Write a new protein. Structure first.
Lengths: 307, 307, 307, 307, 307
């Protein structure tokens, strides 16, 4: 069972595809194991870069393929390196850029909490053939949180485990528990942009929506609400065009629906006030002055949405 | 006739292209057959990964090309593997990411029922040369339905069959029925987002459209319907910009048309009421009070559209 | 002069780029010719798949490059196959996906009639070296026309011809008429989506535009037309964002212009009616009642646009 | 100094990226030179296609790399060909698709005059090693100008010249003037679509904007201009979403700004008319009748913009 | 310690991805070092182009891999060249197109000051093995600033330094300070387009917003501001669709918020004026005439935003 020591260096995490639940990672992989002692020129470690690596493999050098389990497609591999020590030990170093998959919940956008995961596992060698001795992850990030879209919180969670496959090759005894490395990085979304440019004015719209009751005439009260309705549509559009596409409603989406509801509820009351009468024009002096009733009734329903 | 046992592992199904009728699948293929007994180092099965596979083929190893019949373009192949057993048997394992084609009906969006199909067939070897002994599909999915766009329903329907080609080479005996594997996975669209963010407010618009009849004056009744018309246009825009592009109308599309019709019908009636008179301003006391006539007349036409 | 028999199998025609006048084709090519008799293992035809083909060419196997004349870029090639018969004959089979170029007229969108063309020609061998004996095309399509964007009409038109190049090497006798295969597939656009979701409501807008004359007051008549103008703009936007980009106007585009014209003409008349007077407020009783004059005058100009 | 004769065949020029100042070219390159006499099978010219070319270079065939100086990225190379004559001369023929860079001025859009440039230069061989003897360019285009986005005017300008590099190796004598071929193709944009679908209705908007002065009341005059302002915004959006992205304003963009100005100027005058008084409601009978003053004053400013 | 002389030629800097903090660079790299004297054919320098380079490396030619530290993905490499002199020295020349990463602050858009950085470092060889002797950068740009999106200011800033890695191999003496080249190019955004097409009309909107106070009636004053609110939403949409996506607010974004505030503040005062009375309709003769109070009060808050 070959003991493999792994090191991951994370340079950049970007390009989150919400719909695909995907994110891009740039960094380096270092994998170390001890083979049989070699004779290197001089005695210093031998360096074998890109193209030459294949040439060594052909001559019988064992270099196990390490698969990224949760990679979408196949990574852009930059430079490759083999460091061959005379004492036997071998070090493989390579830069990579890949698209990774993970379960991502965006319900509470733009206040998401996400975690970026990497799953490493030998493509063909089982736990008895190849085993992950240890792993360290270096997230050389820091500073300038207000400049980046995501705020990295922890350092990097790590877990070496053994994954069992129940249906595999023509083997039944115990060659079935490939060892898997799982790296987890917690992150929080920078909610500044969405708060100031989306939440805030949307609030002002909903608030100004209620100002329709301060109008004197019934015709004024009613006709103005159609423009108000059309305003919310225009905002929904502005929101939808810029925000990330999802298969579910976010907090903002709910706020939008709330806006439609408030205006429609106002429409109903306005018509009601006018025609619920004991003459014809008996506009209920109190109901027309619900200028304070449902604005705070909206704040009650809004606080109920938090529950 | 070589007996080939196949195994497909499906990891992820995403990125449906409605216009192209296309979807992306990430997973692994396992193919097994029995060749002539080999002499492996020691006696344990020999593993041959990526690059080295070509080398073995060059020395005469028979590795038949299995084409994905319904693939669009050519799949991103990740790691490849050959497992060579001394008793003869050979196992080929490879990860893939592909775009696949299938007939997709989107007429009843967002309540579509779709099925994701995979078609496997030997590229060059006919049924008498190469035959598919059996196939098992593993869809290791489950849980979190309300997080994913699509809800997988069944487990995986499978069909091994023999496909006859009527026009081939200048060969005449019976070498024309290549064996094909067909995998089918049924799926249902998560309609939640479209119901709450599209259907619901659209309904409110159509409903509030009818509130034009509660207006007193004729000028009021008429002018307001122009803003109402403009509102439906703004919504059609908002709808179209976000919804998938299709060469046919969906349920939502029909709802939009219905909205245009309701308003246009109201325009006609409003003008009619005013000018269908026995004086000039004889606005038919009952026709102006069709505030209940066609809202339910719309619910009759709406229920007729279900038939 | 080598006689080459060709067979093209078309699987899918999709992804029309209007601006580039491009379309994507997936299918197979089969090329057959007779070489010098070989000695195959056993006596049955020898199969040579992908990688091994290059190896045979290196040893002197003549495999002539067939260029797609009207291909944009270079096709994604899938699996390749050589079938080598002992009697000499050779069959090359390959799957392809390419972007192809052709003159495409979109003036009468969404009622275009298009034809998809394929042009095959030997890259380096002239008519006296290599000649196309025959060609058959199999468009295995059928059914579900209302599901697909395009409706294939005929079977496939075919033409083998000889193309003369006037400027090549310093060669004079007659090595200049490369033989070219030209496949033509006629198709019609599925106009349903555009009729119901674009043409229909656009018509309703234009028709409702004329309802401005049923307004009593001059201020009502004029102010309302500004909303009406703004409505057409919103529609032009909705249209333009969804419809394909073109360097020329379509039928729909012309409809839009007609919309602007109707409203602008109305604006002119409205102002004219009011100020062409014998006092100040002499709104010409008949010109204000042009509520029927130019709606059918628009139907006369619309029918003139067909001529 | 090897004399190289070059021939470029241009098939298609498309996909202009305005922001990148890029355009796509599909075509063929023919390069000819005379080497030392060979012994070809028989005596006829020997053809060496794609893969086999590398094999010949490895055996010492000199095939100089010709770099496309203004190519963005590296060209999609289709088929390659070497024609080897027994008298010594060599012809290299290859199809290419590339993204090319050139200074592009889009100030006067949609009336741009552009020129598509190609720059060919030997990658490593200087004028004393390799020299471009002659070059002919074939632009096999013609007809259907109203169908294509761009109208090619000339026949293609050519220039062979010598480019001196001042900073190279520690080399001082005269190996520093690589020979460069420069091809120029002049072209004009098809302005039809932008004239009818953008310029024309934008004109109508600006013209109708001035109709605000024919309104009787001050409140009518003022309130209507806010819808008018909103109309220009909607148009700017419609324009911006469809037109190419640029880092500078075009003619159309200026027209938009003119629209904003006209309305804002009207706003100022309207308010001024009302409040510049000798009583309070003394609306200057002449200034309110600037229904003709600044429409033609706009046509004076518009004709000044041409200067 | 091998002395390496580097030369970078920058042809084009384009395609800035604001979200990814990425930019594209086209150019050439020249690397020079002196090896052991060779015997070249004749005596002149030997040129080895693309494919042939690998062949030389296989035979023991040392060609050290130089990694682009801040590259996203892996560069499109064009033509490669080796120049081998007999005196020993070796010159490697290659064209590249890459996506590079750097900290980019876009807060003060469209008046950003950015700097494009390139970081070069040997992939495997430390400062004692390989050392950067010198570097010169040639930015052959100039002229036509008003045609390009970015205006290059300086000539490039250059810095050779030694980067120490703290966690490496089981090596302890001092093999840890790889030598790194850092190139910096300062640039300024061309603000013309955003000033004239965004800032200017946005200003006119805000200015015209304040014209609501010149309206006589309270109903006019209030109802008009709902259109005015809707106008700002339409503008935000227009802005957001065309401007670059960021995770923070820009100057323009702030201007938009200011617009929402101005209108909402106006709404509050308008309602206040009307209902803050000593009777019912005592609209405060001075507060209604704050037609000049807060327009300059906004110019005070606007000037305070600069502090």
């Amino acid at each position: 069972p070959v003991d493999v020591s792994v090191s991951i260096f994370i340079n950049k995490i970007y390009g989150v595809n919400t719909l695909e639940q995907t994110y891009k990672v740039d960094g380096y992989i270092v994998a170390q194991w001890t083979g049989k002692p070699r004779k290197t020129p001089g005695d210093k470690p031998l360096i074998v870069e890109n193209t030459q690596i294949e040439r060594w493999i052909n001559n019988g050098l064992w270099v196990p393929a390490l698969e990224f389990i949760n990679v979408v497609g196949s990574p852009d591999t930059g430079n490759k390196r083999l460091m061959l020590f005379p004492d036997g030990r071998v070090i493989y170093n390579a830069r990579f850029l890949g698209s990774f998959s993970n379960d991502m919940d965006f319900r509470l956008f733009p206040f998401d909490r996400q975690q970026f995961v990497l799953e490493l596992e030998p493509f063909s060698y089982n736990n008895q053939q190849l085993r992950f001795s240890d792993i360290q992850v270096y997230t050389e990030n820091i500073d300038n949180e207000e400049i980046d879209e995501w705020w990295i919180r922890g350092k990097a969670s790590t877990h070496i485990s053994d994954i069992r496959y129940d249906h595999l090759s023509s083997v039944q005894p115990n060659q079935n528990e490939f060892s898997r490395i799982t790296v987890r990085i917690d992150a929080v979304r920078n909610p500044s942009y969405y708060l100031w440019s989306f939440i805030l004015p949307l609030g002002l719209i909903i608030a100004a929506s209620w100002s329709v009751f301060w109008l004197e005439s019934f015709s004024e009260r009613l006709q103005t609400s159609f423009t108000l309705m059309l305003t919310v549509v225009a905002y929904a559009f502005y929101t939808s065009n810029i925000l990330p596409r999802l298969p579910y409603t976010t907090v903002i989406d709910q706020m939008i629906i709330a806006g439609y509801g408030s205006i429609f509820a106002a429409i109903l009351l306005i018509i009601f006030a006018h025609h619920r009468q004991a003459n014809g024009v008996e506009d209920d002096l109190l109901i027309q002055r619900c200028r304070l009733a449902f604005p705070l009734g909206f704040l009650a329903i809004g606080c109920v949405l938090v529950i």
